[PDB]
């Protein structure tokens, strides 16, 4: 009521408490360990249209082991903060894995329009998840060129997000007809990085 | 009512829509008298596009209402005026006797016209479109109420009627100069009737 | 009104919860409220009583006030001049956003009938109809009675009876011409309509407003703006506009429930003047209350009190 | 030079949105009803403030109003605009034009000594005893140039009336404007200058889509009134 | 469980403002629910101490006819009056 | 009581727009009538 005088009456308060006085932990019985370390050192990591997709469960996740010697310049989270890593248990567990030039890096993400995102590979807008980046120049790059990396440049309409198209079809960019060889204006959607 | 059981009387539903299922784009060709989905350089409508009365000056290009609405527009290729109307009109009700009496239905279609269909007996009205009853000419008195002097029942084999509201019984009386009318006999009547006086008294903590 | 059409708005809302439906349920209480006043005011009588054949009442012209017979509309002389003095472009922008207006249960013609009814008995059986089963009895008894009924003796009517006359169908007179030249007095329903426009004419045009949004409509905004942004600017035109509605409908309650409370009373008056006679000061207005008479008006009543006022005092030693 | 005052003239048509009996309240840049502002004989056509906008008049016997010139320095150091009328055509032109201190037209075309950088070069269609009103105004970007000519052409202070110019002109010039010169012929006249300023207006429009009256509201609080 | 700190605020910020909206809602509806109230039971207030404690000449407003005496009666949040009255019948004609 | 100086606020505030009207309207609504309330309970003799 602030104030120092009350008159005589009935008043109502603030809520009664029980205090908890305990917390307790119930949790499942898996022991195993996740294969990231294998799968961050991977030596082979596909293209960006053919981006390799892996299923994992039934193993333990901690996050803090990576960074024993971790370099990621890049790193992203959507729907999630990573303090909470190791206090959180998923459901299913996807990982994809690519390489792209480091330039194209800013067109993956929820929303992001680009060549990328347009016509390799596309994340839905309520996604949640992660992203990990690191260049890579060291051990992807070699003299003379490497080009074992390829990518999708044209096709004929926007992809869906997370969907996989490795179709090797010979894009029609002009208006005459593609037929079934390599024409005018009648390219290979793949190219080289 | 998101309920199994509904009781007598009428309800609420939704407004109508009237689908345009077409799109104009005008830089399609001109189409005129037609509730469609139209484009004029960027701006987007849907309506039906009749002809226009009005004087645009040569650099007017849309005639704005009061609620952030255009009436009149130019075409961008024949640059004559036209007027727009929406025509999303009319909402539905449905009435109903009680659930556990029967299961057939009546729907009434608010200010809207039976010429103009978009529906799928038929009874126009003062209040609109009746649909589903059959229609009488006598007199009773009132059971669920429609509107304008029509109300309507459940009765028998057995369906929906709606007739016109019966004000009363007919009567007159015996005036003249020099007559007087005297009571013999005397009733004693007993009535009820019924008052609230308080409701529930009820207390929130907000903070929890 | 929220969304405009377009599904990708609809969508946003449904996130906001049910709002969307007590608001039409409060207007459906307010709409069920406004057809039980007027059914409640004016149908406390349960006999359609004619009008009575030939018209012989001492010299008292009623001329005036009963329907016309001729006219195929019911409307009396000065109902036809009340029903012209009151009247009633954004009346089709109004059905061009959603806003239905709904027809009115009775009829117009309708509450003419109960009017005219009230009258016939009235004049043509006293204040006994409202007991029972009516019983007729000449006017000039009936007005000797309510004279004695505040205290002068009954002689007095007959030995001034034609004087009498004479004033009564002057006074209407007075009246008839009274309305035709100032409206000022039906300002009291003026009111009761003119209110509602500005309500209207006010939840209209407050679409024009942005609430720090980039473009006033939704069209632009969907055509300008990609699928991610289009949400975290239209969540603030959607919270606008749901204010703006949830204004409007109380402003709604508040004056439903006036409108209430002046219906109440329009409804005691009618019961306990017109249907009888009062010893309550100034409740029929200056003067002792001898007689009254009903007549309908849009969406309200008008009354006539016939009342009696002494005048042209003597000393006199007590 | 003498004080103007402005007898309700100065209107013009806000938009290009039709409308019609529609009374409605708007704000911009207008000229203050009533206002007390500079009136100029001709002899001079000096350089003149343009911070927002002009509505000059011409009272003249016939076209001796050669045209206008806008800029910020009128030389060759900065671009200038140059309006002009060859007797037949109206000519609008952007160009760093190197104007000397009288840019007189003896009726020599000296107005310019040179020209260069010719962003703009414009033809349109052809167009005391002729009052001539015009309506400048400028934004970094589109210019409107609006017209109108009146038959109560005397030489005094202009008679109490009411109509609303048209925006006939619009055109692009994007440069930046600050100071108007006016170019006469030099024959071997008067003219009005009105400052337009941020002004809020009620308009009244009749049953056809026309303007026909209007109200200042800050004229005095009963202004304020009207406006509620 | 999912954010961080300065996250659940941007978060819990939108929740709170809207449960507040909801509650101001309540709050309105209930008041005028209760003047509505309020005025039916002051006139239960007239009407029973007028014909209860008394007889009163005011016609319709106890009941058809007239009125003789009344008796109360209570049930949940109400009240209930049944009016004993008296209604003329069997009407002959005469010469006044 | 909204802005208080800062024309920057008042230009914020004409997003909204209407509601200032409103807010001013319905207390004078309140602020007339009170008065009448006074005059229905002492004004009903017409002398002194
Ligand atoms: C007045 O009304 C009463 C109502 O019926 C009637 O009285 C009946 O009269 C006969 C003999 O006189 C009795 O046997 C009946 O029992 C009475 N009816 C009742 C309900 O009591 C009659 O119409 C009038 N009263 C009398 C005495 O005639
Ligand atoms: C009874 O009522 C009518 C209404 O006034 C009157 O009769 C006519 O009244 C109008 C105007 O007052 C006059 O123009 C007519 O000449 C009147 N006609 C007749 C026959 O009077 C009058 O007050 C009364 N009419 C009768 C017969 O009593
Ligand atoms: C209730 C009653 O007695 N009504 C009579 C009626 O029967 C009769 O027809 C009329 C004229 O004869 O006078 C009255
Ligand atoms: C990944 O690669 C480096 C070099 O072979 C190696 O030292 C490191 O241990 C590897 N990461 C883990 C977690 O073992
Ligand atoms: C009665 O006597 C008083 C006292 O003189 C006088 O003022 C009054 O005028 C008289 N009454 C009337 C109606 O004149």
């Not at chain 1, 260049?135 to 926007?158: A, E, I, P, T």
């Not at chain 4, 290009?16 to 203050?32: A, G, I, N, Y």
């Not at chain 4, 104007?99 to 009726?107: A, I, Q, R, T, W």
Request: aromatic content about 12%.
């Amino acid at each position: 009521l602030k104030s120092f005088t009350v008159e005589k009456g009935i008043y109502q308060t603030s809520n009664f408490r029980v205090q908890p006085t305990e917390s307790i932990v119930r949790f499942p019985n898996i022991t195993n360990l996740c294969p990231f370390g294998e799968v961050f050192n991977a030596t082979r990591f596909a293209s960006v249209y053919a981006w390799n997709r892996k299923r994992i469960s039934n193993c333990v996740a901690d996050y803090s082991v990576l960074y024993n010697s971790a370099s990621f310049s890049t790193f992203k989270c959507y729907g999630v903060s990573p303090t909470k890593l190791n206090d959180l248990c998923f459901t299913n567990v996807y990982a994809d894995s690519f390489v792209i030039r480091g330039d194209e890096v800013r067109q993956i993400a929820p929303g992001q329009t680009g060549k990328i995102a347009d016509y390799n590979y596309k994340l839905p807008d309520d996604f949640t998840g992660c992203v990990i980046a690191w260049n890579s120049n060291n051990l992807d790059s070699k003299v003379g060129g490497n080009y074992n990396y390829l990518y999708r440049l044209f096709r004929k309409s926007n992809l869906k997000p997370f969907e996989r198209d490795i179709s090797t079809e010979i894009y029609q960019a002009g208006s005459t007809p593609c037929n079934g060889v390599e024409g005018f204006n009648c390219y290979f959607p793949l190219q080289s990085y | 009512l998101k309920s199994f059981t509904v009781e007598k009387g009428i309800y609420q539903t939704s407004n109508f829509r009237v689908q345009p299922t077409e799109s104009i784009v005008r830089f399609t060709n001109l189409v005129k008298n037609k509730c469609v989905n139209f484009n004029f350089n960027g701006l987007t409508g849907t309506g039906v596009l009749t002809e226009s009365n009005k004087k645009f000056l040569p650099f007017q290009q849309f005639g704005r209402d009061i609620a952030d609405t255009t009436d009149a527009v130019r075409d961008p290729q024949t640059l004559e005026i036209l007027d727009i109307t929406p025509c999303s009109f009319g909402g539905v009700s449905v009435i109903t006797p009680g659930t556990n009496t029967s299961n057939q239905v009546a729907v009434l279609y608010q200010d809207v016209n039976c010429t103009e269909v978009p529906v799928a007996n038929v009874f126009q009205t003062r209040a609109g479109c009746l649909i589903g009853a059959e229609h009488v000419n006598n007199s009773y008195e009132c059971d669920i109420p429609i509107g304008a002097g029509i109300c309507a029942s459940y009765q028998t084999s057995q369906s929906i009627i709606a007739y016109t509201m019966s004000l009363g019984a007919e009567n007159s009386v015996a005036y003249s100069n020099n007559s007087i009318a005297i009571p013999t006999n005397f009733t004693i009547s007993v009535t009820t009737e019924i008052l609230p006086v308080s409701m529930t008294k009820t207390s929130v903590d907000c903070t929890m | 009104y929220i969304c405009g059409d377009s599904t990708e708005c609809s969508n946003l809302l449904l996130q906001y919860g049910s709002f969307c439906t007590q608001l039409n349920r409060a207007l459906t209480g307010i709409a069920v409220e406004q057809d039980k006043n007027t059914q409640e005011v004016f149908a406390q009588v349960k006999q359609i009583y004619k009008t009575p054949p030939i018209k012989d009442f001492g010299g008292f012209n009623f001329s005036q006030i009963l329907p016309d017979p001729s006219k195929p509309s019911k409307r009396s002389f000065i109902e036809d001049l009340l029903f012209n003095k009151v009247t009633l472009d954004l009346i089709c922008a109004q059905k061009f956003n959603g806003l239905t207006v709904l027809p009115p249960l009775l009829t117009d013609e309708m509450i003419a009938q109960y009017t005219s009814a009230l009258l016939a008995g009235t004049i043509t059986s006293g204040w006994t109809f409202g007991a029972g089963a009516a019983l007729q009895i000449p006017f000039a008894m009936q007005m000797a009675y309510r004279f004695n009924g505040i205290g002068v003796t009954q002689n007095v009517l007959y030995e001034n009876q034609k004087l009498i006359a004479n004033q009564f169908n002057s006074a209407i007179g007075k009246i008839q011409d009274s309305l035709s030249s100032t409206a000022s007095a039906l300002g009291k329903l003026q009111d009761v309509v003119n209110q509602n426009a500005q309500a209207l004419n006010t939840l209209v045009k407050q679409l024009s407003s942005n609430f720090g949004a980039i473009s006033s409509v939704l069209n632009d905004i969907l055509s300008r703006l990609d699928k991610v942004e289009a949400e975290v600017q239209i969540d603030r035109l959607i919270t606008g506009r749901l204010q703006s509605l949830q204004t409007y409908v109380t402003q709604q309650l508040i004056r439903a429930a006036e409108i209430r409370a002046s219906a109440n009373l329009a409804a005691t008056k009618m019961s306990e003047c017109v249907l009888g006679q009062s010893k309550r000061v100034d409740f029929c207005g200056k003067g002792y209350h001898l007689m009254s008479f009903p007549q309908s008006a849009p969406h309200g009543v008008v009354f006539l009190h016939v009342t009696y006022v002494p005048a042209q005092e003597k000393n006199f030693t007590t | 030079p003498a004080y103007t005052n402005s007898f309700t003239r100065g209107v013009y048509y806000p938009d290009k949105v039709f409308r019609s009996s529609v009374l409605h309240s708007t704000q911009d840049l207008f000229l203050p009803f009533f206002s007390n502002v500079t009136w100029f004989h001709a002899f001079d056509n000096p350089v003149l403030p343009f911070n927002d906008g002009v509505y000059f008049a011409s009272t003249e016997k016939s076209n001796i109003i050669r045209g206008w010139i806008f800029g910020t320095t009128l030389d060759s150091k900065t671009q200038s605009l140059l309006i002009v009328n060859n007797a037949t055509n109206v000519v609008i032109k952007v160009c760093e034009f190197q104007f000397c201190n009288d840019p007189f037209l003896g009726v020599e075309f000296r107005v310019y000594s040179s020209a260069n950088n010719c962003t703009f070069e414009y033809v349109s269609q052809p167009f005391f005893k002729n009052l001539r009103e015009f309506v400048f105004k400028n934004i970094d970007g589109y210019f409107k140039i609006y017209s109108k000519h009146t038959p109560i052409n005397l030489v005094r202070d202009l008679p109490q009336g009411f109509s609303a110019l048209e925006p006939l002109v619009d055109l692009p010039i994007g440069i930046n404007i600050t100071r108007f010169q006016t170019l006469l012929a030099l024959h071997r006249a008067a003219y009005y200058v009105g400052y337009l300023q941020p002004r809020t207006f009620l308009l009244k429009y009749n049953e056809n889509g026309t303007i026909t009256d209007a109200v200042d509201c800050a004229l005095d609080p009963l202004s304020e009134t009207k406006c509620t």
